[PDB]
Amino acid sequence: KLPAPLLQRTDRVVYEDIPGILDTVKDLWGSQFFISGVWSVYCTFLLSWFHALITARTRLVPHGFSKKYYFNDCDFQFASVYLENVLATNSTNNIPWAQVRDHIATIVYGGKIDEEKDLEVVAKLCAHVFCGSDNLQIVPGVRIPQPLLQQSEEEERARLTAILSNTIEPADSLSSWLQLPRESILDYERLQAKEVASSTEQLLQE
């Protein structure tokens, strides 16, 4: 609680940034400059997509999670450094995807989470993003092919940015892209409109 006299003789604004998934992926990708081969850049791309997806899923309080968490840039830095260290100590290109999956789900992102339900939510999203399979359908529209073993990192950054530019964000991105049922986000919209209408009723009967 800030003091009342400080909050009185001032002009107050309340801000709301875009919850768009693709905008957050683009911001994370543009803020990153990658440097270790092509796989570090590929894993940074995967981590940016995962962080944007989990931050978008956080905003839906009753259905996306069970509470309101706050995953931020420091958590992204910790995960990125863990991927860099995993790629550095394992240069035989047999990447321990189980290691990064469990470490990100349980220690990096799931450290602050006490309830179990949110923990297998994070575990499911980690399993989807960091599956390490040949074909990766992150969302039902776009795919991220793995880097090939005859090129450099600049062309990989260009290719992933080109994949970003091709992507279009539909209006139902809060349920199709987050692997949520449509009835769940419909119920969330119903609850927010219900609390708004009920509060207007209480403010109107006075």
Partner 1 sequence: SLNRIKKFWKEAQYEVIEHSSGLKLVREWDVLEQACKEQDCLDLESKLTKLSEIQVNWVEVQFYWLDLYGILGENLDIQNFLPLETSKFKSLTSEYKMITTRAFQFDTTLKLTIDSLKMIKSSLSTFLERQRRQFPRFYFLGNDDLLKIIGSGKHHDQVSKFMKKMFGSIESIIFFEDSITGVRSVEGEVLNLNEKIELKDSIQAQEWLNILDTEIKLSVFTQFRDCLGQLKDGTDIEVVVSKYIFQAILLSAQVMWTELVEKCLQTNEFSKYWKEVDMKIKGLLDKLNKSSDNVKKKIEALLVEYLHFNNVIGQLKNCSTKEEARLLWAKVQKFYQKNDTLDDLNSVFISQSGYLLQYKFEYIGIPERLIYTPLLLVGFATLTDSLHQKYGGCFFGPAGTGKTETVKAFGQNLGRVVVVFNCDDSFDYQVLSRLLVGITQIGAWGCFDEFNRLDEKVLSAVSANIQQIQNGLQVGKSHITLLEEETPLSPHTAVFITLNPGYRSELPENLKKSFREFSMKSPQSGTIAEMILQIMGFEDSKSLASKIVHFLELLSSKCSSMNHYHFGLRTLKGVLRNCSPLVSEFGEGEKTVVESLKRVILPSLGDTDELVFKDELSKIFDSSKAIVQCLKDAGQRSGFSMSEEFLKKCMQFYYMQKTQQALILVGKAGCGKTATWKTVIDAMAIFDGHANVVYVIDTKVLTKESLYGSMLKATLEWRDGLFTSILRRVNDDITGTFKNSRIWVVFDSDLDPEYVEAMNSVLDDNKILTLPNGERLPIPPNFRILFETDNLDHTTPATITRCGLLWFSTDVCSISSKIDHLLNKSYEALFELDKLKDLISDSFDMASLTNIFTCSNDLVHILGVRTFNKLETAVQLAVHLISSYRQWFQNLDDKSLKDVITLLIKRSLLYALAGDSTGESQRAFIQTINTYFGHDSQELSDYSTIVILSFSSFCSEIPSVSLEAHEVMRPDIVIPTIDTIKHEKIFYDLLNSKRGIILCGPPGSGKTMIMNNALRNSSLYDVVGINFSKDTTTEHILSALHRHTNYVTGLTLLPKSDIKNLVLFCDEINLPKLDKYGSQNVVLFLRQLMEKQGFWKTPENKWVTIERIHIVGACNPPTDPGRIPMSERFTRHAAILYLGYPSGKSLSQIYEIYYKAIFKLVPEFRSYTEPFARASVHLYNECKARYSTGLQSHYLFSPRELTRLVRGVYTAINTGPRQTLRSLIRLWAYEAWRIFADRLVGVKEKNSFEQLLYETVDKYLPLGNISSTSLLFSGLLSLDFKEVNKTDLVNFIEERFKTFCDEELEVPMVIHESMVDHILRIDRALKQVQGHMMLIGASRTGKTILTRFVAWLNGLKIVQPKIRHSNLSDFDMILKKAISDCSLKESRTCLIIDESNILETAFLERMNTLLANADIPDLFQGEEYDKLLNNLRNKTTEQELYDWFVGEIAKNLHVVFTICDPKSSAMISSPALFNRCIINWMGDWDTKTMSQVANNMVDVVPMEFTTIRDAVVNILIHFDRNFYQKMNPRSPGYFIDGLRALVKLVTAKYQDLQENQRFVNVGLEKLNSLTFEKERWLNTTKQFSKTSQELI
Which chain residues interact with partner 1 by CB under 8 A?
74, 78, 81-82, 85-86, 89, 96, 98-99, 102-103, 106-108, 111-114
Report, in Å, the least distance between residue 132 CB and partner 1: 11
Locate the DSSP E strands across the chain. none
Give burial (CB, 10 Å; 0-12/13-18/19+) of 44. Answer: buried
- Shortest separation between residue 123's beta carbon and partner 1, angstroms: 14
Question: Is residue 56 within 8 Å of residue 24, measured between CB atoms?
Answer: yes
How far apart are CB 53 and partner 1 at their closest, in Å? 22
Kindly report the CA angle at 178 between 172 and 180, in degrees rounded to 5? 80
Smallest separation, CB 137 to partner 1 (Å): 24
Structure-block tokens of residue 145: 């092919």
Helix (H) or strand (E) holding 188: helix 182-204
118 or 156, CB closer to partner 1?
118
- Pick 114 or 195: Cβ nearer partner 1: 114
Q: Which residue lies nearer to partner 1 by CB, 90 or 137?
A: 90
Tell me whether residue 45 or residue 82 sits nearer to partner 1 (CB atom). 82
Q: Position of tokens 């290719």?
A: 159
